Every structure is written in C-alpha cells, then in structure tokens.
Design an enzyme around this catalytic site. Structure first.
Site, short mmCIF file in Angstrom:
data_model
loop_
_atom_site.label_atom_id
_atom_site.label_comp_id
_atom_site.label_asym_id
_atom_site.label_seq_id
_atom_site.Cartn_x
_atom_site.Cartn_y
_atom_site.Cartn_z
N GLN C 15 11.54 -35.81 -25.28
CA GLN C 15 10.94 -36.88 -24.49
C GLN C 15 9.69 -36.41 -23.77
OE1 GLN C 15 14.56 -37.15 -22.07
NE2 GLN C 15 13.27 -36.93 -20.24
N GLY C 16 8.95 -37.36 -23.20
CA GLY C 16 7.80 -37.05 -22.36
C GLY C 16 6.71 -36.27 -23.06
N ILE C 17 6.15 -35.29 -22.36
CA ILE C 17 5.04 -34.52 -22.91
C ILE C 17 5.43 -33.76 -24.17
CG2 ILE C 17 3.55 -32.49 -22.47
CD1 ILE C 17 3.46 -33.55 -19.49
N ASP C 52 19.42 -25.53 -26.08
CA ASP C 52 19.43 -25.47 -24.63
C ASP C 52 18.61 -24.27 -24.22
OD1 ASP C 52 19.87 -25.48 -21.91
OD2 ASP C 52 22.03 -25.88 -22.09
N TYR C 140 8.94 -26.00 -7.07
CA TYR C 140 8.19 -26.32 -8.29
C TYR C 140 6.89 -25.53 -8.42
CZ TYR C 140 6.25 -29.27 -12.02
OH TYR C 140 5.74 -29.75 -13.20
N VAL C 173 2.02 -37.20 -14.75
CA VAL C 173 2.05 -37.86 -16.05
C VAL C 173 3.24 -38.82 -16.15
CG1 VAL C 173 2.15 -37.49 -18.56
CG2 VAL C 173 0.91 -35.87 -17.11
CL LIG Z 1 13.80 -32.64 -24.47
#
Ligand SMILES: [Cl-]
Lengths: 234, 234, 234, 231
Positions: C15-17, C52, C140, C173
């Site tokens: 998913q995402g970037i 993982d 972060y 983002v």
């Molecule tokens: Cl992922």
C-alpha cells in the site's frame, strides 16, 4: 583571561554585535582595534580607527599595516529588505559588496599575513538566513549563504597553515540596526513575542561565542557555522 | 566564573570529554555532580555518584531525586567500529541503547523538572559523524544522527519553557576510549596524521564550548549542533 | 522503457508509497516483486510475496534467494506520534526496529550481492522529518535521521562497486496510513488545506523519483537525500 | 510522455547540461525553446534563439515575450578556478553576474508571469560546490551557495501561486567546458568514487522529473547528483 596576548581587529566595531565582540575581547585581555565608520561611537571604550569596509584599498591598507594580527572579526553587513520582485539591482550590488565582497578582501589581506606569522583565527558574522528562508529577505539570504561558503573554502585552504576560519550565524539579535528597522525596542516587543523563547538575542550572547573561537580553546574549530538563533530555524 | 550559581549533572563524567566538562564546570563556579560507571575516577576531583546509563530506572531516580538542576550534560556513549557488513545486531542494540535511548530517558526525566523551575540547559555530546560520512562507522553514525534529531525535537518542544537543548559534535578527540580503540597510544599518531591540523582534538576544547552553552551567555542557543572537528568534514 | 530488464524488490509494497513504486516500476519495464505483510492487496497487480520486515531471518532468506537483484526499495515504516513526554519505549523499540534496523538487515543482505554483479540501486524511503523538526514527531524524526545517515554510510562503502544508495525524503503524502491517523477525508482535508500547496503529496510523485534513481540515468546519484515535501521545510 | 504539451525555455541550452536538458524535454513531448549564445549548436534539433544571459534587458524581453511558459531552466554558468589569493575581483564580478544575478533576473521576469498563468516549474542548475568545499573553487562555491539560497527563497514566496522552484546540484559532469578546463578527463575520472565522470543525460532525466506534473510536490529542494563526491 582567555585572550591575553592576542591582537584583534574587529571590522564594524562601532555598534551592535561588532561592538559587543570588541568589548568582550578587550575584557578577556586582547589588544583590540575597532574599525568602524563612526569611531567616535567608541570614544573611551575600545581603541578605534575609521574604516569604510566598502573601500577595498582602505581594508588592505589597514590590515597590511598592522604589526601582528591574531584574530580578525568581520562584523560588517547590511540588511536589504524585500521579496524577489521588491529586490533591486542596487540592493543586490550594495549587499553583496558589504556582506560578502568586503569579507573576501579582508581575508585576502589577513590570511597570508597570518599564515606568515604562524597562525590565527578569522570569525565571520553571517546569519541564520544563510540556512533558513524567511519572507522578505531574498538578497540578504543569498549574500549570507555566499559568506558561509567562503568561510568554509578559506578554512580548508588555510588549515594546514594554522589559520582557523569560522562563521557565527545569529538569529534575531537586539541591535541598533534592528531597532531602526523595527522602530525601537517596543517595536521589537511585538516580534520578541513571536519568538520561541519569547525574547530576542543579546549582542553579548554572540560575543561570548566569538571569544571561544578566538581563544586557544577554540583552536580545533574550523570551517564551522555556529547557529545562535533561539530555535527560530527549527 | 561563567557558572557560579549553577547545579550541573554530567552523565559519564568518569573520563574523556565528560570528565573534561565536569572539571571545567567545576572551575567555572558550578556545583557539579558527576555520574559514571566508575565513580572512583572523580575522587578529589568532582562530587560523584555511581550510574549505569543503560538502566532506565537508575537514570530517572538520579535526575528526579535532584533538588534543582540547571545543566544536564549527556556525555555517555560507545563507539562501535565497522562498516555495514562488520556491524552486528549486538553493536546496534548496545549503541542505540547507550548513545540514544539513554539520552531519551535522561531528557524525559530532566526537561519537565527544568521547565517547572523556569529554565535550564541540556547539552548532548553527539559527533560530527552525525553529518559527515567516514568509513568504518556505520552504527555509530546512525546513533549520532538520531541523537541530533532528538536534540532538535526537544529544543523545539521546550523552548517556550526556557529550557535550551543543544548538541556539540566533536571530531576526533584524544580520549582514553579512543586510545583503547586504537589499541594504545602507539596507534594515535596514525589518527593525528590524517587530521588537517595534524593533531587530535583536546577534550578541553569541547569543554570550553559546553561552558558557553551552560552559561547565561549561551541562553540564545537552542536546537543547534556545534561542530568542532578540526575541519575534517570540509 | 526506463527500467527495461531490471529486477526489483520493493519491501512494504502492499500500500501507499511502496505500492506506487512497485506499480510505477512495472509500468517502466522492470520485473518487480512486492514484499508485504498483505500480499492479498497486490494479486493481479504486481507479483507478491509475504514478508514481515521485522523478521531478520525472513528478510535475509528472501533477498539471498533471488537470482539477481538490480533494485531494492525499502518502503517499510511506521509513524508514531507524540512529543518527548508522550513517546514511549514501546514507540521507540517498534519504530527503530521497522524504520531503521529492518533496512540495516536488508542492505546487509542485498549490497554484497549487488556489488558482486557489478552494480545496483538501493532506494530508502526516509522522510523530511530527518531534517525538519515538527511538533509531535520525536521518535519518528530520530529513526529517519538514523536512516539517512545509514544511507550515506552504505553509499560511501559501496560506491566503488557501482552500487548506489539514496534516500527519498517525502513530506506529507496521502496514503491509507495517513488517513488511518487523520480520519478518512474530512480532516485529513483540514490538514491539506493548511499546507503550503493546499494539498498532500501523491504516492505517484514519490514513485516517479524512485524510477529515476532505479534507472541507468540515475547512476550518478549516490549518497543523496532527495526532499519532496511540498515546501514544508522552507 | 512526461512533458506532453508543456512549453519550456532552457537558458544556455547550447551545450553540456543545458543542451542535454533541452533535448530530453523534447523527447518527452515538450515544446522547447533553447536560448544560448550559440543557437547554431541547436539548430535543426531544437528551436533556438540567441540570448546573452548577462544582458538584463534581453532576458526580460525574451521571457515576457513568450505566449506561455510552463518550465524555465537556468543552466547558464561559468567556473572560475583558484583559491582565495588567486581569485580576482574580475572573477568575482563575472561569476556572480552569470551564475547568480542573471538567475535573479530570469526569475523576476518569469515567476510573476507563471503565477498569473496557471503556475509552472523553475529549475536552477547549481552545483554540489554549494555544499561541498573543494580546493581551487573559492569564487564558484560562493556563487552556487547564493543560487541555492535564492532558489529556496523564491520557492517559499511563489509556492502559493502554483510555481515550483528547485535546484539540481551536479558533481563533475563531462561537458565541453570541463574538457577544455582539463584527456585529461582520465586523471580526473580516476579520482572519482565511481571511477568516471557524470553524464549530462543523468542530470537531464532529473530535470524532466522536476519539470513534469509528477515533480510538482518538490519545491525549494536542492537535488545533489555528484557520484558520491560530497560524502
Ligand atoms: Cl505493505
């Protein structure tokens, strides 16, 4: 105490940070000469000579005329204001002349002299504007980024010769030039309210760091740009 | 005389830079508490306490147990050696624990206490490795970059409470731990020959800067990372 | 056309970037394998494998089990929120594990392999948080600063082998995990409106830069950290 | 396909990095005008006009005369050589004029125009010398640091108007000017980590990203492409 036996020249020593550094140097035992457009400002505080830092010939004449120079401080500068479209060619030329080219000349004059006298320390007062973009400082930031690059270039080239070159990058410091731009110290109370620390820097806070760089204990610092800005560039 | 009023805690004050800072703070008028794994090294030098910075409870107990704290110096650290493939998970865990996590804990303990008392100054001893890539320092560099980021984050968050948080970023400084690293004093000259100044840094050169940051004159610096590296990152 | 005959592994491609990079890579001719906790999300989109990234053994086994690897993308990451006192040891351990240590493992596995085949490209998805301090990102930013330093350290070590290592440092983002911590749309929308560009970044904007870095035309970039942040760090 | 329908102006498009950028833009579908002291170098390949970037009036006239302008590339520059004592005031003036002041002018002309016409992308070709100190580059480093500061300042001021401003900071790239400065190239390639010089095409592909719609979230950035030389 910390600068006994050191001969220092401070360019633009007449007021603000320049003056605070000259006074701090003298307090720490340095033989100080304050160069400025207005030497009368220094009547009875530090030895002073008239110097217009825009005058290349006068800059070279003064520095080359000294018998020994251990510390040179470049505190000269001007703050043009305006964004990209407000900025003019006259702003550009005036600011690059005093903020950067003046320092170019001072270092050209002083570094060989220093190298040939064993070593030394050069301290350039830049600005956090060299790193941090803020509205209405287009020309000013460009000149100060140039100054930091020059500081580092000089540092690399003359490190094997015992001459340290460093920059201090102040944020917003309460100075006479700031007061005239912002309209007195209560003009300044407004912006002091906007700072993280809820106050502006003091010229003495910058001077104490210069004392460090000029001192024998500052001898392992070269090519550094020391930010003192109250966290404003965070 | 730059710190006469102030109570200072120095973590890892037993040797090297931490000890130089403790001794310098003492000389400048501060009441210093030196925490270290080996408190005997500070006998007759500075008041000391036994502390394992890897122990969260111990760190919190020490700092929360102090009546008032004006200056906190985090000089603890380990320098694992090796490139990417030589680095182990054990190096990772040990170095991130001591170099970074223990500072996280120290700051969690100290910053609220300092905030409440109206202000104070936290000084983290990082490394120019946080910025400058050199061979054989893969883990070390990551931990020190983490540390500078943490330094800035804490600075932003507690600037309104008058608590400054800054990092000093030394280059190669002559310490007992560097000497043990280099396999002995015989191994030092190789390190010195690689330096622009052809000499190693002195812990006193770092200490003088910490004195500035601990002093009232350093009160406008926060969120800064001061590089003192003999020009090596040029 | 731009990644023809390249074999690429994207970690956290689900998913995402990460997903945008895998899709873009495949569009540009690369053979791509998207490793993810959630391979079900990629079926009929890109070839997928369950991984993982917190599992060191699984990371080494997948990477060492590939015939040839031209491009490695580390898009794994978690974003804990909180200031210094809100942040926990749990946050610390989890974020340093996934954001940094898992990349350590992946590069340990991949880089000697790539070095032996005469070249390759590693692309780490860091964050502008590595450079720019913002409220509520204590843990972060520390993990991402560590990651950028690791990127540069690996880059230096393996440059002579023709293997490049670079970081892309995105700002905010629009991703499923951003909406999981914002709301879904309504604000979410509030945060977008307040940004300089009045919008969030698109994963595809990061992905196109990844294509450059993976491509033969990207072969002169190494050790760089490319900020793509909508101007938010200005 | 990355720049279909975009109108681009490349200043100093005649050779080296500027030329590679003009040709790359055209391959990606943009309508390109290459401005240069030597338009004869571009003719037949890229539409070209003569422009001396040192002439302020000429710069404004060209830019304000364009119908529409989606992308501006400032690839003009000069590399003086020398340390502090070698450097002259003439070196200073000439390098600050071309490397920085002419970019000041180009942006003064272009940014308001772009702001009023649906935004755009400005790409300044700086140098890794803006960040990394190397011997014999005293003046050059100063000008390129000024240019990066200018890039960020312009980016902040015009972000609200749909204009992006970014810099690419190349390391040592094989160009005609470099070759003249230096076979020659060999001794200078040996002391590179990658054991070779950068290619203009490597810079140009990054300029395409920045010029493209997909580059729109980058602004105020300085992208280093230097073969690891500043590590
Ligand atoms: Cl992922």
């Amino acid at each position: 105490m910390k600068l006994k036996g050191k001969k220092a020249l401070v360019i633009a020593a007449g007021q603000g940070i320049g003056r605070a550094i000259a006074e701090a140097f003298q307090r720490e035992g340095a033989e100080v000469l304050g160069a400025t457009l207005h030497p009368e400002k220094l009547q009875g505080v530090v030895p002073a000579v008239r110097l217009d830092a825009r005058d290349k010939e006068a800059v070279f004449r003064l520095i080359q005329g000294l018998d020994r120079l251990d510390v040179l401080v470049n505190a000269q500068g001007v703050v043009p204001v305006g964004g990209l479209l407000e900025a003019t060619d006259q702003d550009w030329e005036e600011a690059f002349l005093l903020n950067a080219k003046s320092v170019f000349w001072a270092m050209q004059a002083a570094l060989p002299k220093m190298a040939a006298q064993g070593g030394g320390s050069v301290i350039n007062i830049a600005s956090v504007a060299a790193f941090k973009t803020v509205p209405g400082r287009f020309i000013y930031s460009a000149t100060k980024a140039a100054l930091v690059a020059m500081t580092k270039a000089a540092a690399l080239e003359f490190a094997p010769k015992g001459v340290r070159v460093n920059a201090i990058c102040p944020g917003t410091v309460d100075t006479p030039s700031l007061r005239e731009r912002a309209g007195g110290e209560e003009g300044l109370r407004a912006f002091a309210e906007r700072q993280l620390l809820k106050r502006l820097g003091r010229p003495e806070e910058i001077a104490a760091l210069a004392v460090y760089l000029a001192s024998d204990e500052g001898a392992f610092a070269t090519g550094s740009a020391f930010v003192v800005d109250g966290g404003m560039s965070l």
